[PDB]
Amino acid sequence: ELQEKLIAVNRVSKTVKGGRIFSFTALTVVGDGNGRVGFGYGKAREVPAAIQKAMEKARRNMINVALNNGTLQHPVKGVHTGSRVFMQPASEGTGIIAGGAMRAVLEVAGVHNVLAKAYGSTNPINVVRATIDGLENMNSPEMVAAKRGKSVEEILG
Protein backbone atom coordinates (compact mmCIF):
# COMPACT_ATOMS: atom_id res chain seq x y z
CA GLU A 1 0.00 0.00 0.00
CA LEU A 2 2.47 2.62 1.20
CA GLN A 3 5.73 1.71 2.90
CA GLU A 4 6.86 4.65 5.04
CA LYS A 5 10.27 3.72 6.40
CA LEU A 6 12.07 6.13 8.66
CA ILE A 7 15.82 6.34 8.15
CA ALA A 8 17.51 8.82 10.45
CA VAL A 9 17.00 11.22 13.33
CA ASN A 10 19.55 13.89 14.23
CA ARG A 11 19.58 16.37 17.11
CA VAL A 12 20.48 19.71 15.56
CA SER A 13 21.16 22.91 17.50
CA LYS A 14 20.69 26.65 17.03
CA THR A 15 22.66 28.29 19.87
CA VAL A 16 20.55 31.35 20.62
CA LYS A 17 21.75 34.00 23.06
CA GLY A 18 20.13 32.31 26.05
CA GLY A 19 21.37 28.83 25.23
CA ARG A 20 21.21 26.00 22.76
CA ILE A 21 17.99 25.09 20.97
CA PHE A 22 17.75 21.36 20.32
CA SER A 23 15.64 20.30 17.36
CA PHE A 24 15.20 16.97 15.60
CA THR A 25 15.44 16.35 11.88
CA ALA A 26 13.79 13.17 10.74
CA LEU A 27 14.10 11.62 7.31
CA THR A 28 11.51 9.30 5.83
CA VAL A 29 11.35 7.39 2.56
CA VAL A 30 7.85 6.50 1.41
CA GLY A 31 6.60 4.64 -1.60
CA ASP A 32 4.32 1.90 -2.84
CA GLY A 33 7.00 -0.63 -3.68
CA ASN A 34 6.31 -0.72 -7.42
CA GLY A 35 8.07 2.41 -8.73
CA ARG A 36 6.56 5.14 -6.56
CA VAL A 37 9.16 6.53 -4.18
CA GLY A 38 9.91 9.81 -2.46
CA PHE A 39 11.77 11.14 0.53
CA GLY A 40 10.87 13.82 3.03
CA TYR A 41 13.53 15.41 5.17
CA GLY A 42 11.41 17.10 7.80
CA LYS A 43 12.49 18.83 10.98
CA ALA A 44 10.75 20.05 14.11
CA ARG A 45 11.13 20.50 17.85
CA GLU A 46 9.77 17.10 18.88
CA VAL A 47 10.48 13.75 17.26
CA PRO A 48 6.84 12.66 16.72
CA ALA A 49 5.96 15.90 14.93
CA ALA A 50 9.27 15.84 13.07
CA ILE A 51 8.67 12.34 11.75
CA GLN A 52 5.11 13.21 10.79
CA LYS A 53 6.16 16.39 8.98
CA ALA A 54 8.88 14.47 7.16
CA MET A 55 6.32 11.91 6.03
CA GLU A 56 4.22 14.78 4.68
CA LYS A 57 6.90 16.01 2.29
CA ALA A 58 7.92 12.45 1.44
CA ARG A 59 4.36 11.81 0.31
CA ARG A 60 3.84 14.99 -1.65
CA ASN A 61 7.28 14.66 -3.30
CA MET A 62 6.91 11.20 -4.84
CA ILE A 63 8.43 10.21 -8.18
CA ASN A 64 7.95 7.35 -10.60
CA VAL A 65 10.49 4.67 -11.46
CA ALA A 66 10.41 2.39 -14.51
CA LEU A 67 11.86 -0.77 -13.00
CA ASN A 68 11.82 -4.35 -14.27
CA ASN A 69 10.80 -7.40 -12.25
CA GLY A 70 11.49 -5.70 -8.95
CA THR A 71 15.08 -4.98 -9.97
CA LEU A 72 16.94 -2.23 -11.78
CA GLN A 73 17.33 -2.09 -15.54
CA HIS A 74 21.08 -1.51 -15.79
CA PRO A 75 23.99 -0.63 -13.47
CA VAL A 76 23.55 3.05 -12.67
CA LYS A 77 25.60 5.70 -10.87
CA GLY A 78 23.98 8.32 -8.69
CA VAL A 79 26.50 11.01 -7.73
CA HIS A 80 25.13 13.81 -5.55
CA THR A 81 26.97 16.28 -3.28
CA GLY A 82 30.12 14.22 -2.89
CA SER A 83 28.13 11.02 -2.27
CA ARG A 84 28.51 8.67 -5.23
CA VAL A 85 26.40 5.52 -5.25
CA PHE A 86 26.75 2.63 -7.69
CA MET A 87 23.69 0.39 -7.93
CA GLN A 88 23.50 -2.74 -10.02
CA PRO A 89 20.73 -5.08 -11.14
CA ALA A 90 20.93 -8.55 -9.66
CA SER A 91 19.10 -11.85 -10.07
CA GLU A 92 15.99 -13.27 -8.48
CA GLY A 93 17.58 -14.39 -5.22
CA THR A 94 20.18 -11.90 -4.08
CA GLY A 95 17.81 -9.76 -2.04
CA ILE A 96 18.97 -6.20 -1.40
CA ILE A 97 22.67 -5.60 -0.77
CA ALA A 98 22.55 -1.91 0.11
CA GLY A 99 24.29 0.16 2.74
CA GLY A 100 22.77 2.35 5.42
CA ALA A 101 20.08 4.84 4.38
CA MET A 102 20.03 3.03 1.02
CA ARG A 103 18.47 -0.27 2.08
CA ALA A 104 15.39 1.65 3.20
CA VAL A 105 14.90 3.65 0.01
CA LEU A 106 15.44 0.57 -2.14
CA GLU A 107 13.11 -1.66 -0.12
CA VAL A 108 10.42 1.01 -0.25
CA ALA A 109 10.91 1.83 -3.94
CA GLY A 110 10.25 -1.87 -4.41
CA VAL A 111 13.44 -3.09 -6.07
CA HIS A 112 13.71 -6.55 -4.55
CA ASN A 113 16.97 -7.60 -6.22
CA VAL A 114 19.90 -5.19 -6.31
CA LEU A 115 23.63 -4.85 -5.74
CA ALA A 116 24.58 -1.45 -4.36
CA LYS A 117 27.55 0.46 -2.99
CA ALA A 118 28.03 3.87 -1.39
CA TYR A 119 31.27 5.56 -2.35
CA GLY A 120 32.29 8.98 -1.09
CA SER A 121 30.45 10.37 1.91
CA THR A 122 27.81 8.16 3.48
CA ASN A 123 25.62 10.83 5.00
CA PRO A 124 22.02 9.54 4.99
CA ILE A 125 20.50 12.63 3.36
CA ASN A 126 23.09 12.65 0.60
CA VAL A 127 22.93 8.94 -0.15
CA VAL A 128 19.13 9.13 -0.19
CA ARG A 129 19.12 12.01 -2.67
CA ALA A 130 21.77 10.17 -4.67
CA THR A 131 19.93 6.86 -4.87
CA ILE A 132 16.74 8.64 -5.85
CA ASP A 133 18.71 10.56 -8.49
CA GLY A 134 19.90 7.23 -9.87
CA LEU A 135 16.50 5.56 -9.73
CA GLU A 136 15.10 8.59 -11.55
CA ASN A 137 17.54 9.04 -14.42
CA MET A 138 17.32 5.30 -15.17
CA ASN A 139 16.49 4.02 -18.66
CA SER A 140 13.93 1.40 -19.53
CA PRO A 141 13.94 -0.53 -22.82
CA GLU A 142 10.59 0.98 -23.71
CA MET A 143 11.90 4.50 -23.17
CA VAL A 144 15.08 3.80 -25.11
CA ALA A 145 13.32 2.22 -28.07
CA ALA A 146 11.06 5.27 -28.00
CA LYS A 147 13.94 7.77 -27.98
CA ARG A 148 15.63 5.97 -30.83
CA GLY A 149 12.77 5.20 -33.15
CA LYS A 150 13.38 1.46 -32.97
CA SER A 151 11.66 -1.74 -31.96
CA VAL A 152 12.29 -3.21 -28.52
CA GLU A 153 13.73 -6.26 -30.26
CA GLU A 154 16.11 -3.88 -32.05
CA ILE A 155 17.17 -2.05 -28.88
CA LEU A 156 17.57 -5.22 -26.79
CA GLY A 157 19.69 -6.97 -29.38
Binding site: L6, R11, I51
Partner: protein, 70 residues
Protein backbone atom coordinates in the same frame (compact mmCIF):
# COMPACT_ATOMS: atom_id res chain seq x y z
CA UNK B 1 95.54 14.51 50.88
CA UNK B 2 96.36 18.21 50.64
CA UNK B 3 99.43 19.78 49.00
CA UNK B 4 99.40 23.40 50.20
CA UNK B 5 102.13 25.40 48.45
CA UNK B 6 100.22 28.57 47.53
CA UNK B 7 102.08 30.68 50.13
CA UNK B 8 105.68 30.94 51.26
CA UNK B 9 106.16 30.38 55.01
CA UNK B 10 105.06 27.23 56.79
CA UNK B 11 102.68 29.13 59.07
CA UNK B 12 100.73 30.38 56.05
CA UNK B 13 100.84 26.98 54.35
CA UNK B 14 99.70 25.19 57.51
CA UNK B 15 96.78 27.54 58.11
CA UNK B 16 95.95 27.33 54.39
CA UNK B 17 95.98 23.53 54.30
CA UNK B 18 93.83 23.43 57.42
CA UNK B 19 91.47 25.90 55.73
CA UNK B 20 91.20 23.76 52.60
CA UNK B 21 90.58 20.68 54.75
CA UNK B 22 87.90 22.42 56.82
CA UNK B 23 86.24 23.72 53.66
CA UNK B 24 86.31 20.41 51.80
CA UNK B 25 84.99 18.41 54.75
CA UNK B 26 82.25 21.01 55.18
CA UNK B 27 81.38 20.73 51.49
CA UNK B 28 81.55 16.91 51.41
CA UNK B 29 79.41 16.71 54.57
CA UNK B 30 76.63 19.09 53.53
CA UNK B 31 73.77 17.15 51.95
CA UNK B 32 71.20 18.47 49.48
CA UNK B 33 67.68 19.00 50.78
CA UNK B 34 65.13 16.28 50.03
CA UNK B 35 62.98 17.39 47.11
CA UNK B 36 59.38 16.97 48.23
CA UNK B 37 57.47 16.03 45.05
CA UNK B 38 54.22 17.97 44.82
CA UNK B 39 50.77 16.74 43.85
CA UNK B 40 48.49 18.59 41.40
CA UNK B 41 46.49 21.52 42.70
CA UNK B 42 42.90 21.03 43.83
CA UNK B 43 42.00 23.85 41.44
CA UNK B 44 43.49 21.72 38.66
CA UNK B 45 41.64 18.63 39.86
CA UNK B 46 38.32 20.45 39.70
CA UNK B 47 39.27 22.00 36.36
CA UNK B 48 39.92 18.47 35.10
CA UNK B 49 36.60 17.19 36.41
CA UNK B 50 34.77 20.19 34.92
CA UNK B 51 36.33 19.64 31.50
CA UNK B 52 35.34 15.98 31.81
CA UNK B 53 31.76 16.96 32.63
CA UNK B 54 31.63 19.51 29.79
CA UNK B 55 32.80 17.13 27.08
CA UNK B 56 30.44 14.52 28.53
CA UNK B 57 27.53 16.96 28.52
CA UNK B 58 28.22 17.57 24.84
CA UNK B 59 28.62 13.89 23.95
CA UNK B 60 25.34 13.10 25.73
CA UNK B 61 23.17 15.04 23.30
CA UNK B 62 25.61 14.08 20.55
CA UNK B 63 25.21 11.04 18.32
CA UNK B 64 22.24 8.83 17.54
CA UNK B 65 18.89 9.74 19.08
CA UNK B 66 16.66 7.01 20.49
CA UNK B 67 12.95 6.78 19.69
CA UNK B 68 9.92 4.57 20.22
CA UNK B 69 7.83 5.57 17.20
CA UNK B 70 8.07 4.54 13.56
Amino acid sequence: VIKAQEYRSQELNREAALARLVAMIKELTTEKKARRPTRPTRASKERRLASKAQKSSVKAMRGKVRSGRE
